[PDB]
Ligand binder design. Structure first.
Ligand SMILES: NC(=O)c1ccc[n+]([C@@H]2O[C@H](COP(=O)([O-])OP(=O)(O)OC[C@H]3O[C@@H](n4cnc5c(N)ncnc54)[C@H](O)[C@@H]3O)[C@@H](O)[C@H]2O)c1
Ligand SMILES: NC(=O)c1ccc[n+]([C@@H]2O[C@H](COP(=O)([O-])OP(=O)(O)OC[C@H]3O[C@@H](n4cnc5c(N)ncnc54)[C@H](O)[C@@H]3O)[C@@H](O)[C@H]2O)c1
Lengths: 311, 308
């Protein structure tokens, strides 16, 4: 039995049916504080900041694995750091301790490039590097990785984690992160409208398409234990680009659309992060691989967003 | 008005009178969940894990600065990680939130070499380095440094911190800490008794004497917030030695001294930390300096422990 927390978000909306198709709708339990249609898959209300709720869910459903997605992202976290701390820090601790106290075999946590800071090298950064995040989100996430590793080394609890770069998708709309523009821009492109970008035109960041993000999280989940040396904090990425570069590439398909740059607080967050990641450890230790390069995700996004908007 | 949490500990026992001496007795307030003699200075019971208590104290005593010493150390943290997380993680968060809410203009947190892990270079480690701690204590402490820097960059709360190595002292009794062997060994030596050390004979670690530890904490506290760039995570040390090295030096003064090694979980903790630290940043930014080398610390300890 697999429990997914924070399943109503950008990733969860697709991870739940992804897990269901692979292991059976019957073996997956979706959960969040906000319910959304999960197409037949069981959904339960679960606030991760409430230890009692986690215990009850794990007990009732004899949970064997937890994909812990629940959390307040980078941007939203800066608007309410107290909320981010409660949900991300105490919530992750609750999940780890609950898993340990019960018979949960594995816990998989999606960390982020948000664990990096100004001192972190900007190009092809490895997994073991300087981690001095400057956002509440980042502090709770590096803490989660360390707590995760500690629960394995101390209690033998199989906790694994990877660091996601910006995730691009079309099924569920991102709203609380810093890399959200990479999705928003497609809507404006397909409608031939002028997109107002909140990141600087040359703000380079690592990114990846949802299909690969889902595959990576599940591949890490299924990875052989004997090769998991790093175990927590695996850098994962597909490509790096700036807003002006993505605009230009989309332009190659849709010439009648434009962009303007009006940077806000999110650009300041992005400035503290690295431009590209080295994902060699993930590939060497559990076979991480990318199937969608930039061109392929751009064309796939245009196709699906165009159908969604009735274009 | 300066508030000190965890004032009854090894550091607090000495920092309080140190503060009263420099800033006046009526300007210091001691606090802890366990009371000890404060030689007149006001003392109040305060559980840092209870946010409401912190708020009342800061409000009632018009606290302007906080030296946050309360916490669970490395060894005890491994014996009870849940307690370490509760008082260290939640406690420090409570202090920061309370400081941010009210009118607190300065908060000083004593971090530790415990924030380092196996990947951290072993020699002359600079402050900006790999920090992947493997103890619950270490996890809570690197989080403390990060939350601190965050509150400063986000809310302007003047939070500063330095990373203490093992601290040697005679005032307070040792508490079986990972580096407390450096204190216990003196009790046994002065009695000419064979000491049973729990760290490996060649387990090198950075250390420093209490007088310098106190001076460093206050020098950091008195620094002009404009001069501080690193601000949090300042590596600080006086010297590096191994148990066999300290034993040898002590034996030069007390030749009948004997020692045997029975390593335990604390040696495994120590093995994950660096051997020596580069403290250039502390010296360049707020003038960090050492006045007690290893010899003076050894002779001074022997003198005091003999007296009791
Ligand atoms: N999307 C990305 O580009 C990206 C990148 C790196 C890391 N991540 C990580 O992936 C996870 C989810 O990402 P996402 O993009 O789907 O986020 P999202 O903002 O789309 O969804 C987050 C979900 O968390 C839920 N939630 C908030 N508080 C909760 C609580 N107390 N209990 C249970 N649920 C709660 C929300 O209701 C929401 O459905 C997070 O841990 C995030 O840090 C995402
Ligand atoms: N002593 C060292 O060598 C050393 C080295 C590096 C960092 N530090 C840091 O210095 C600080 C204190 O060190 P120490 O050696 O004096 O520790 P200590 O163990 O001697 O004292 C800690 C104090 O914390 C108190 N305490 C525990 N829970 C509390 C709570 N909920 N509310 C208030 N007080 C509580 C204890 O009762 C105790 O008096 C800690 O933050 C520690 O991590 C110490």
């Amino acid at each position: 039995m697999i429990l997914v927390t924070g399943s109503s978000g950008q990733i969860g909306t697709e991870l739940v049916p992804y897990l269901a198709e692979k292991y059976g709708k019957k073996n997956v339990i979706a959960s969040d504080i906000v319910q959304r249609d999960t197409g037949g898959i069981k959904f339960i209300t679960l606030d991760v900041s409430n230890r009692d709720e986690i215990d009850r869910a794990v007990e009732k459903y004899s949970i064997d694995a937890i994909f812990h997605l629940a959390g307040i992202l980078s941007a939203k976290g800066e608007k309410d750091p107290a909320l981010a701390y409660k949900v991300n820090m105490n919530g992750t601790y609750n999940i780890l301790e609950a898993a340990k106290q019960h018979r949960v075999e594995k816990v998989v946590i999606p960390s982020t490039i948000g664990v990096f800071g100004p001192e972190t090298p900007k190009n092809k950064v490895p997994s073991i590097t300087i981690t001095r995040p400057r956002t509440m989100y980042g502090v709770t996430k590096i803490a989660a990785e360390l707590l995760g590793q500690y629960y394995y080394e101390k209690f033998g609890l199989d906790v694994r984690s990877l660091r996601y770069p910006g995730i691009i998708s079309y099924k569920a709309e991102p709203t609380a992160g810093t890399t959200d523009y990479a999705v928003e821009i497609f809507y404006y492109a397909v409608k031939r409208e002028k997109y107002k970008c909140y990141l600087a035109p040359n703000r380079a960041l690592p990114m990846m398409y949802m299909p690969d993000a889902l595959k990576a999280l599940v591949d890490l989940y299924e990875a052989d234990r004997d090769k998991l040396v790093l175990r927590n904090g695996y850098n994962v990425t597909a490509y790096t680009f700036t807003p002006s570069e993505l605009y230009s590439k989309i332009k190659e398909r849709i010439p009648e659309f434009e962009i303007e740059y009006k940077e806000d607080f999110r650009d300041k967050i992005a400035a503290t992060w690295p431009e590209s990641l080295d994902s060699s450890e993930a590939s060497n230790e559990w076979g991480f691989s990318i199937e969608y390069d930039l061109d392929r995700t751009i064309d796939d996004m245009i196709d699906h967003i165009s159908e969604k908007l009735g274009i």
